[PDB]
């Protein structure tokens, strides 16, 4: 069971990298959305 | 004629002081400032717009 727990720790490391990948995906999505909104707002302010 | 108000009189030295004092308002500084402002506004506009 300790060896199985070590395999579970490896799977948990894979879960942590999956959590990292989902966090990177959400971070990139929020970052692109905010940067696009900010660029549009800055362009609108510059046009005004 | 009638009321003694002549249409015009010869210039006097006291009148000459006011004639010398009278001048057109000078706008050369204002025109230079307006030209500088419009030129700098054009320069700012050149890179202001998003590419």
């Amino acid at each position: 069971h300790q060896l199985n727990e070590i395999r579970k720790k490896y799977t948990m490391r894979k879960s942590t990298i999956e959590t990292l990948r989902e966090k990177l995906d959400q971070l990139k999505r929020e970052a692109r959305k905010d940067v696009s909104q900010k660029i549009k707002d800055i362009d609108d302010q510059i046009q005004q | 004629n009638d009321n003694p108000i002549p249409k015009s009189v010869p210039l006097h030295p006291k009148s000459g002081k006011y004639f010398h004092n009278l001048h057109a308002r000078d706008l050369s500084n204002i025109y230079q400032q307006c030209y500088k402002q419009i030129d700098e506004t054009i320069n700012q506009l050149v890179d202001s717009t998003s590419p």
Side-chain angles (χ1 to χ4, degrees):
Chain A
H1 278 290
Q2 289 178 2
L3 297 182
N4 298 133
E5 287 299 329
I6 296 177
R7 301 192 72 174
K8 286 304 187 49
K9 275 301 183 185
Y10 295 155
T11 305
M12 196 163 203
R13 187 263 306 266
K14 302 178 64 182
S15 297
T16 59
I17 76 183
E18 290 176 0
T19 309
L20 286 178
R21 92 179 171 86
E22 73 87 12
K23 283 194 306 294
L24 294 184
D25 294 329
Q26 71 178 355
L27 255 293
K28 87 178 186 301
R29 288 187 302 105
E30 69 88 16
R32 69 179 176 88
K33 286 181 62 58
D34 64 57
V35 73
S36 61
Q37 289 180 358
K38 287 306 177 301
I39 287 306
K40 288 177 183 182
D41 294 331
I42 290 303
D43 296 331
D44 179 70
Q45 287 178 4
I46 288 179
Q47 180 264 358
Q48 188 269 348
Chain B
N1 41 14
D2 304 330
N3 189 24
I5 297 292
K7 185 53 188 60
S8 45
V9 290
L11 188 66
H12 283 250
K14 282 80 55 183
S15 301
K17 313 290 183 188
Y18 292 88
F19 182 77
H20 297 347
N21 294 330
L22 254 59
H23 64 288
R25 174 78 273 180
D26 170 71
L27 296 187
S28 62
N29 201 333
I30 303 301
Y31 273 107
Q32 287 177 3
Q33 289 179 5
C34 179
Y35 266 87
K36 186 54 185 58
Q37 184 61 31
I38 190 173
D39 293 337
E40 70 84 6
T41 303
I42 295 176
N43 286 273
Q44 203 285 311
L45 181 75
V46 162
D47 49 357
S48 73
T49 57
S50 180

